[PDB]
Motif scaffolding. Structure first.
Motif, PDB file in Angstrom:
ATOM      1  N   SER A  64       0.828  -1.204   0.000  1.00 60.56           N
ATOM      2  CA  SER A  64       0.000   0.000   0.000  1.00 60.56           C
ATOM      3  C   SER A  64       0.864   1.257   0.000  1.00 60.56           C
ATOM      4  O   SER A  64       0.552   2.235  -0.688  1.00 60.56           O
ATOM      5  N   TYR A  65       1.959   1.244   0.767  1.00 66.25           N
ATOM      6  CA  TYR A  65       2.879   2.379   0.802  1.00 66.25           C
ATOM      7  C   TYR A  65       3.542   2.586  -0.557  1.00 66.25           C
ATOM      8  O   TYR A  65       3.710   3.724  -1.009  1.00 66.25           O
ATOM      9  N   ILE A 111     -17.973   2.933  23.079  1.00 66.90           N
ATOM     10  CA  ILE A 111     -16.554   3.288  23.100  1.00 66.90           C
ATOM     11  C   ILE A 111     -16.059   3.405  24.541  1.00 66.90           C
ATOM     12  O   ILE A 111     -15.025   2.829  24.911  1.00 66.90           O
ATOM     13  N   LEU A 166      -1.362   3.767  12.281  1.00 60.91           N
ATOM     14  CA  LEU A 166      -0.855   3.621  10.918  1.00 60.91           C
ATOM     15  C   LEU A 166      -1.809   4.159   9.849  1.00 60.91           C
ATOM     16  O   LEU A 166      -1.729   3.747   8.688  1.00 60.91           O
ATOM     17  N   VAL A 193      -0.346   5.204   6.251  1.00 61.73           N
ATOM     18  CA  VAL A 193       0.003   4.228   5.220  1.00 61.73           C
ATOM     19  C   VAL A 193      -1.175   3.318   4.873  1.00 61.73           C
ATOM     20  O   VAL A 193      -1.273   2.843   3.737  1.00 61.73           O
ATOM     21  N   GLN A 194      -2.075   3.074   5.825  1.00 64.44           N
ATOM     22  CA  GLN A 194      -3.221   2.210   5.563  1.00 64.44           C
ATOM     23  C   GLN A 194      -4.279   2.924   4.731  1.00 64.44           C
ATOM     24  O   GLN A 194      -4.917   2.310   3.867  1.00 64.44           O
ATOM     25  N   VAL A 243     -11.988   8.523  16.763  1.00 65.20           N
ATOM     26  CA  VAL A 243     -13.431   8.565  16.502  1.00 65.20           C
ATOM     27  C   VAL A 243     -14.126   9.357  17.595  1.00 65.20           C
ATOM     28  O   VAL A 243     -14.812  10.350  17.329  1.00 65.20           O
ATOM     29  N   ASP A 281     -11.459  -0.734  14.572  1.00 59.71           N
ATOM     30  CA  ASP A 281     -11.501  -0.204  15.936  1.00 59.71           C
ATOM     31  C   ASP A 281     -10.117  -0.083  16.574  1.00 59.71           C
ATOM     32  O   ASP A 281      -9.978  -0.201  17.796  1.00 59.71           O
ATOM     33  N   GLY A 285     -14.935   3.941  11.681  1.00 58.16           N
ATOM     34  CA  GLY A 285     -15.678   2.919  12.397  1.00 58.16           C
ATOM     35  C   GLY A 285     -15.411   1.495  11.944  1.00 58.16           C
ATOM     36  O   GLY A 285     -15.740   0.555  12.675  1.00 58.16           O
ATOM     37  N   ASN A 286     -14.831   1.306  10.756  1.00 61.04           N
ATOM     38  CA  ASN A 286     -14.598  -0.041  10.240  1.00 61.04           C
ATOM     39  C   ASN A 286     -13.368  -0.715  10.834  1.00 61.04           C
ATOM     40  O   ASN A 286     -13.188  -1.920  10.629  1.00 61.04           O
ATOM     41  N   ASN A 340     -10.479   4.128  17.570  1.00 64.86           N
ATOM     42  CA  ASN A 340     -11.566   4.539  18.467  1.00 64.86           C
ATOM     43  C   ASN A 340     -11.263   5.841  19.187  1.00 64.86           C
ATOM     44  O   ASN A 340     -12.151   6.684  19.360  1.00 64.86           O
ATOM     45  N   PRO A 383      -4.120   6.698   3.274  1.00 66.65           N
ATOM     46  CA  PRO A 383      -3.638   8.077   3.109  1.00 66.65           C
ATOM     47  C   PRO A 383      -4.692   9.046   2.602  1.00 66.65           C
ATOM     48  O   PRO A 383      -4.572  10.252   2.859  1.00 66.65           O
ATOM     49  N   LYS A 422     -20.610   1.518  14.931  1.00 67.16           N
ATOM     50  CA  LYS A 422     -20.559   2.904  14.487  1.00 67.16           C
ATOM     51  C   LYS A 422     -21.965   3.485  14.326  1.00 67.16           C
ATOM     52  O   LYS A 422     -22.929   2.768  14.045  1.00 67.16           O
ATOM     53  N   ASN A 470       0.945   4.105  -3.153  1.00 67.40           N
ATOM     54  CA  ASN A 470       0.559   5.511  -3.024  1.00 67.40           C
ATOM     55  C   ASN A 470       1.801   6.398  -3.145  1.00 67.40           C
ATOM     56  O   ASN A 470       2.324   6.935  -2.167  1.00 67.40           O
ATOM     57  N   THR A 478     -17.767  -2.785  18.911  1.00 64.03           N
ATOM     58  CA  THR A 478     -18.169  -1.458  18.463  1.00 64.03           C
ATOM     59  C   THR A 478     -19.348  -1.567  17.510  1.00 64.03           C
ATOM     60  O   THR A 478     -19.496  -2.554  16.782  1.00 64.03           O
TER      61      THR A 478
END
Lengths: 347, 212, 154, 105, 348
Positions: free
Chosen positions: A289-290, E49, C65, C68-69, C130, C124, C121-122, C127, C71, E5, A293, E3
């Motif tokens: 992924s890095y 949460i 992260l 990178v996860q 959020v 956690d 929210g996908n 959190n 951007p 959302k 992008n 959780t």
């Protein structure tokens, strides 16, 4: 600048006393004092009139010349027609303030008639103008909704509005009025990088356009359409950019290429008990992924890759190295980095 | 808060400010509240047809602030555009729960009597203005003094006052109703205008002075 | 910037295919963001030689992260902080920056805030972030209602 | 916790038999269902709050706390027993070191 | 317990709500029912949460309670200072415990005090005493040459100065540190193991770095504070407290520390050609110094770790880093510790 009631009245008094010797009484009640007060009040009102005109002028009057329209919260209005069972035999009265209620239950909108209308002696149909009570876009109503009248009569059959209410208007702030003007003025710039970029982005299916500039030639390439550029879009955008290019400078349009990188990295972990299939899979996903992008014409510096891969967890990772990556990889301006094949070894 | 007024035949905007606030000088700020263009008050309606929302003519309403809110710029801005929505905002907005108006008047001082309803389409009904004030007085009267889960000492002992219909019980009921109605600060006073008896049935009516 | 310095981490953070069932963004820079961002990018700003308050939302974003996860969503958060940072500056100092912000610019920040809040929210991990952003989602709405009114007052 | 108790006495608390569609009751029933489901989650969190019954993410949290890392494709039942054994590790004596060969066989 | 959302809750709620009627399906933002249901789902989301966070805090607290391994509180800052006399001394003069030392600099108003007495020997000329900081946290980590005066009469004292910086002043331990400490504690229940002697010697709060070297018939312990200087009182306390983990049939010795010196030379190509002055270089040298000084005996200098540390700065600013001298990882001997010497940083 505007002067108040008191100054005008005092100047009138002083000038009367200077001119007139006949007049000496100025008690509240003199015909002459109130004559002067009337004059002064009208003068002050004209001063406030000029004040409001100047306020409008400074607010939007200079900008009105230019091609823009201003909105003043005008309530919605539209033509409405009424029908009767039989032709009339009397001049029926239609008062101002008559309410035309919505026939649909779901529509709470209501409308009122600003001016009186007098039905003809024998006309079977008459059209009048009705203004809504509520300003804003909420006053808009679809066609075929206004079919009830509060001041009903035996002769009246039904009401209908053939044309829909289009004159619904909502007023924004001065900033919103000024921003479109700024955008229009800015858009008239040409023969510059930012203006070329805006003019390319004006046409649809143009995103992430990159411009490379050289004294000799100017080269523009993009991955607008699903990561690829088509020949037809190149022909279309070449013709559009003619107005934007500098006079006497060549313009060239080309496609975007990619360079797939192969890397087999090795990672030492302080706590070998933690290793597992999930951990190396996640590391490979983060690396790919890095590497995916990356910005156009971005050199693949090994230092940033090292920083990125180590920043996953400082305690976990102890040492990192690449078997099949010697130094940083330089890329042309038109090249973009992609992940071809990635493998991660755990030590 | 504000007072209502209407445009009279060939009344000048100077005349209004002088009569209500004393000094004529205040008309200048008073036109901004009614959002008026220069022809602030004009006699003819076919002249109001020039640009209807920015003028007043003979027979039209006007807004008259209290003197403390006269100088407030926020009161000016709000009164400029809201116009008739003043009364609703000033009396406030609430969910309508008089769904069964015929029904709740058959079982008062019993619970489970009120319920949400639907008006318009796809949205719970709401009440505003004077109707809201009535509904709230109605609910306050038909609720026992310590039965809401917070802020108790709300409601009435109307469920406790059932007695031998001799007049002292009727004055007691009158006083409880008046106390209950005068609890809300928005209402000025209440007073009885009739009490009347029909064997085992009480009947009577109360006038309440609601602020303008 | 004119009055007091700012933390080093915030200066460093600010200079730089998912779908929701309720929201969509548009990446407009607000007019005030456009001119404040240039000042942040330039060196003409005081800055502090030490950092504290490790509980702020900035360090939370840094620790995860998310860079990178995702951007894209990391970018949107920077945009949210850029508008949110500027509208704090004008009230406390430099009132001349007013009449450069409009309710439309402030409105779309909630669009972008909730468009990222569903995404957060996908997973956690996030959190802590959020929880923070939801508190600001009601904060902006108050400013939108009062901003046309405050501007006329000032 | 009982949303049908504990509320304004006049809001009707069971549906109208008089006609078909009752939005009032639909709303109260939806809200009561949501908060009952919340209550059931908050009761169900008793088992997650104890190492003896923690599962999925919470057992991985426990194992990270104690330092014992989850093995790939490991079920909770054996992972708990492993954690308990490793916390009470028996090593240092020649017989104990020999007997530790069972974990290396 | 998981959780959910806001939008998931809100959707389930409206989906349930629409059962049995169709006079509600209008949920524009202007609708009030939508606002109420958004607020209820917001509160339920926050509840979930906070529940999850409180569960984590309960787990941590039970871990505290079960084994009585309480988290380390705020740790005092301390070090050494040099007293300088006008002349060599004429009598066996004395400093009492709890003498105050204050820095004249306005930017470091924090005070310091002594804990054990000292006598100055006659005809001596200098003396080194230990001072402990009343405040605890980051404020005790003053720079070099900060403590100027003793804040008293100072009749026979000319000036006071400190040659080394204070590094033991630290904030409260985070969750991660506590988890690391606890995993070593769980793995240290069996005695006669190196990993056991690690905890054995780490149990003292003041100790930060610790390493154990073994041989055929002797055990040796190497430890130090954040400053990197062993003290006799610490050695005594270690011997006293460590009896419950010492191997029975093998001798143990706690001593041995040396400062390994290395000169780091790096080349940094900033992405902005502008703003390449020595001010940023000073900051970079100070970050490198803070990184290198933070290592301990058990850690070793790694090139990639240094690269990560220095590249914590945003990669848009610094685009490339390289080392002109450093090309291989340096292995630290067990007794010695690697730290910064004299550092030289330049653009190119």
């Amino acid at each position: 600048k505007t002067r108040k009631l008191t100054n005008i009245l005092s100047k009138l008094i002083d000038k009367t006393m200077a001119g007139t010797s006949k007049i000496t009484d100025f008690t509240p009640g003199s015909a002459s004092r109130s004559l002067l007060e009337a004059v002064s009040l009208e003068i002050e009102q004209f001063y406030i009139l000029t004040k409001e005109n100047i306020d409008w002028g400074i607010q939007e009057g200079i900008i009105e010349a230019f091609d823009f329209q201003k909105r003043q919260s005008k309530r919605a209005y539209g033509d409405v027609t009424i029908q009767f069972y039989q032709p009339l035999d009397m001049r029926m009265y239609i008062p101002a303030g008559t309410t035309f209620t919505s026939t649909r239950q779901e529509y709470p909108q209501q409308f009122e008639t600003l001016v009186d209308y007098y039905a003809e002696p024998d006309s079977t149909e008459i059209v009048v103008e009705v203004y809504c009570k509520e300003t804003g876009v909420a006053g808009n109503v679809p066609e075929g909704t206004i079919n009830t009248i509060a001041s009903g009569s035996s002769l009246i059959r039904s009401v209908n509005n053939e044309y829909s209410f289009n004159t619904g208007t909502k007023e924004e702030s001065q900033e919103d009025f000024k921003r479109r003007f700024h955008s229009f003025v800015e858009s008239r710039g040409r023969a510059t990088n930012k203006s070329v970029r805006y003019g390319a982005l004006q046409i649809p299916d143009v995103e992430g356009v990159y411009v490379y500039e050289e004294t000799g030639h100017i080269t523009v390439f993009a991955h607008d359409r699903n990561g690829n550029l088509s020949d037809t879009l190149k022909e279309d955008i070449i013709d559009a950019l003619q107005d934007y290019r500098p006079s006497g400078i060549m313009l060239d349009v080309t496609g975007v290429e990619k360079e797939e990188v192969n890397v087999s990295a090795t990672v030492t972990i302080s706590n070998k008990s933690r290793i597992g299939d999930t951990l190396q899979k996640h590391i490979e996903s983060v690396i790919r992924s890095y590497l995916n992008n990356l910005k156009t014409s971005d050199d693949l510096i090994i230092t940033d890759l090292i920083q990125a891969i180590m920043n996953i967890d400082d305690v976990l990772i102890y040492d990192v190295s690449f078997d099949n990556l010697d130094e940083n990889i330089i890329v042309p301006p038109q090249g973009i980095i992609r992940a071809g094949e990635i493998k991660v070894e755990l030590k | 808060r504000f007072k209502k007024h209407v445009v009279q035949h060939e009344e000048t905007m100077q005349a209004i400010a002088q009569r209500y606030y004393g000094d004529v000088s205040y008309w200048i700020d008073l036109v901004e509240h009614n959002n008026l263009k220069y022809p602030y008050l004009v006699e003819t309606d076919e002249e109001k047809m020039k640009d209807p929302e920015r003028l007043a003519s003979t027979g039209d309403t006007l807004i008259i602030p209290i003197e403390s809110d006269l100088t407030d710029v926020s009161a000016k801005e709000i009164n400029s555009r809201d116009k008739d929505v003043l009364v609703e905002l000033a009396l406030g907005r609430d969910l309508n729960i008089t769904a069964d108006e015929k029904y709740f008047n058959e079982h008062g001082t019993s619970d489970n009597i009120l319920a949400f309803s639907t008006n318009g389409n796809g949205d719970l009904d709401t009440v505003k203005g004077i109707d809201n004030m009535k509904q709230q007085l109605q609910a306050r009267l038909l609720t026992p003094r310590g039965s809401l889960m917070l802020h108790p000492n709300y409601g009435s002992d109307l469920h406790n006052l059932f007695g031998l219909n001799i007049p002292e019980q009727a004055t007691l009921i009158e006083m409880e109703v008046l106390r209950t109605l005068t609890s809300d600060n928005r209402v000025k006073s209440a007073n009885l205008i009739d009490w009347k008896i029909q064997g085992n049935v009480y009947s009577g009516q109360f006038s309440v002075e609601i602020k303008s | 910037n004119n009055f007091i310095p700012q933390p080093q981490g915030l200066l460093r953070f600010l200079n730089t295919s998912f779908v929701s069932k309720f929201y969509t963004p548009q990446l407009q820079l607000s007019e005030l963001a456009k001119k404040v961002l240039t000042n942040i990018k330039t060196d003409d700003i005081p800055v502090l030689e030490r950092e504290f308050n490790d509980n702020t939302i900035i360090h939370k974003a840094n620790d995860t992260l998310l860079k990178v996860q995702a951007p894209r969503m990391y970018m949107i958060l920077q945009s949210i902080v850029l508008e949110a940072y500027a509208i704090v500056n004008c009230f406390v100092e430099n009132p001349s920056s007013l009449k450069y912000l409009t309710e439309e610019d402030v409105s779309i920040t909630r669009e972008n805030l909730n468009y990222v809040a569903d995404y957060l929210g996908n997973y956690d991990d996030y959190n802590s972030v959020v929880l923070d952003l939801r508190d600001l989602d009601l904060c902006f709405s108050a400013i939108e209602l009062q901003l046309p009114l405050i501007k006329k007052e000032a | 916790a009982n949303f049908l108790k504990n509320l304004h006495p006049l809001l009707r608390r069971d549906r109208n038999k008089k006609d078909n569609q009752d939005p009032n009751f639909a709303l109260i029933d939806a809200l009561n269902e949501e908060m009952n489901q919340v209550e059931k989650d908050a009761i169900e969190s008793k088992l997650q709050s104890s190492l003896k019954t923690s599962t999925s993410e919470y057992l991985d949290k426990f194992g990270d706390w104690f330092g014992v890392y989850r093995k790939t494709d490991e079920k909770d039942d054996v992972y708990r027993a492993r954690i308990i054994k490793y916390l009470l590790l028996k090593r240092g004596t020649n017989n104990a070191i020999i007997d530790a060969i069972k974990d290396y066989l």
